Write a protein that binds this ligand. Sequence first.
Ligand SMILES: *[C@@H]1O[C@H](CO)[C@@H](O)[C@H](O)[C@H]1NC(C)=O
Ligand SMILES: *[C@@H]1O[C@H](CO)[C@@H](O)[C@H](O)[C@H]1NC(C)=O
Lengths: 50, 57, 7
Amino acid sequence: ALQIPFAMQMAYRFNGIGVTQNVLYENQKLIANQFNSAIGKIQDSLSSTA
Amino acid sequence: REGVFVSNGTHWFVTQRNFYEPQIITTDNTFVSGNCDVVIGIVNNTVYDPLQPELDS
Amino acid sequence: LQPELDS
Ligand SMILES: *[C@@H]1O[C@H](CO)[C@@H](O)[C@H](O)[C@H]1NC(C)=O
Ligand SMILES: *[C@@H]1O[C@H](CO)[C@@H](O)[C@H](O)[C@H]1NC(C)=O
């Protein structure tokens, strides 16, 4: 296992889908809010819908 | 443009991820996007330009 | 190169 800063890991996930990594760093706060909100919706889905 | 910016503290370099191969940081192995304010954790170092000494010659 | 080629 090689440690890497998590934002840079997401940058290389983005290059893995042809989105140029500057698109991540120019939007990082927005992406973090979307990701945190999306995980939140899973808890409501599982809590409501057994 | 490919790989990672890395430093031994005394210098800055770029390499591909899967094997250490330090190269100087340049207008050829980098691309610009916008002003510095937006990027979290950005740093200051002189990006070299291979054309410059040739315009000086 | 076009704007740089003043040299
Ligand atoms: C990085 O983490 C250190 C503590 O480990 C902290 O002092 C510093 O402000 C952090 N910088 C960024 C850009 O997160
Ligand atoms: C980077 O350089 C600029 C201009 O010299 C300076 O304003 C800025 O404070 C520097 N960055 C840091 C982290 O100090």
